[PDB]
Design a protein around this ligand. Structure first.
Ligand SMILES: [Ca+2]
Length: 265
């Protein structure tokens, strides 16, 4: 797998990453309170349930539904299921349910070190992601994909950014990829180090992706001087379904041990 980068990477990184010495934890969820996610930290995204999600995706994102989003045994669980939730008011005809949480309108950050420790969702069809979008159109406002994986190639981790100049609508996105051991069976830490000068995206303290601010003051190539909010989801189909959907793979879970955000303060 590759995010339209068949014969190389467009934003190569190869350097260590770690929480900077002058940073402090400014936000966390440790997911140690069973039941629904803390509503002071997380909202459900239902914005396109009735309209249809993007990317040829197949899922309906259920809100307030423990079968799809629950805190359990020290993790956030986002679970995909093969089912039609036809009596939801915003039902959109989908054959699958999943979860999509975000901090939009509750918590956002400009610059910082973001660490998300997770075990991913497997089974052909699955497309787990950990990513960010600007609080204040798209893609000009900036998108930061800290972690994507597509479960037809479940050991490949993808790290990508999108801007007006560099984005998947015109196939000019800046990204890289790496290999992680059994990501659906063991935890890894997926990390972003975002400063005014560059972003690093990594796994387990190794940056495999680097995107520099070109310092031209062009918002089209660097929109990332404004706050972003965090997003956790498991999509179904689209890129995740490039080799089909495995009916037998459902239900499939992503387990998030924690989200930690650090900043200079
Ligand atoms: Ca935890």
């Amino acid at each position: 797998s590759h995010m339209q980068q068949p014969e190389g990477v467009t934003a190569p990184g190869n350097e260590p990453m770690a929480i900077p010495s002058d940073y402090k934890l400014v936000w966390a969820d440790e997911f140690n309170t069973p039941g629904a996610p803390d509503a002071k930290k997380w909202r459900y995204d239902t914005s396109r349930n009735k309209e249809g999600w993007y990317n040829n995706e197949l899922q309906y994102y259920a809100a307030g539904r423990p079968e799809n989003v629950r805190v359990e045994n020290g993790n956030l669980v986002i679970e995909t299921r093969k089912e039609r939730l036809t009596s939801m008011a915003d039902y959109g005809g989908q054959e699958y349910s999943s979860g999509k949480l975000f901090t939009q309108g509750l918590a956002d950050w400009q610059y910082g070190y973001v660490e998300v420790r997770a075990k991913l969702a497997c089974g052909k069809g699955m497309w787990p992601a950990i990513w960010m979008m600007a609080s204040d159109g798209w893609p000009a406002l900036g998108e930061i994909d800290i972690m994507e994986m597509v479960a037809w190639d479940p050991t490949t981790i993808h790290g990508t950014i999108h801007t007006k100049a560099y984005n998947h609508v015109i196939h000019t996105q800046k990204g890289s990829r790496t290999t992680a051991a059994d990501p659906c069976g063991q935890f890894h830490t997926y990390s972003l180090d975002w400063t005014k000068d560059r972003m690093l995206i990594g796994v387990d303290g190794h940056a495999y992706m680097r995107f520099d601010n070109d310092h031209k003051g062009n918002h089209d190539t660097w929109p990332f001087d404004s706050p972003q909010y965090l997003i956790l989801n498991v999509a179904i189909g689209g890129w995740g379904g490039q080799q089909g959907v495995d009916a037998a793979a459902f239900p499939s879970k992503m387990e998030v041990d924690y989200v930690r955000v650090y900043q200079k303060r």
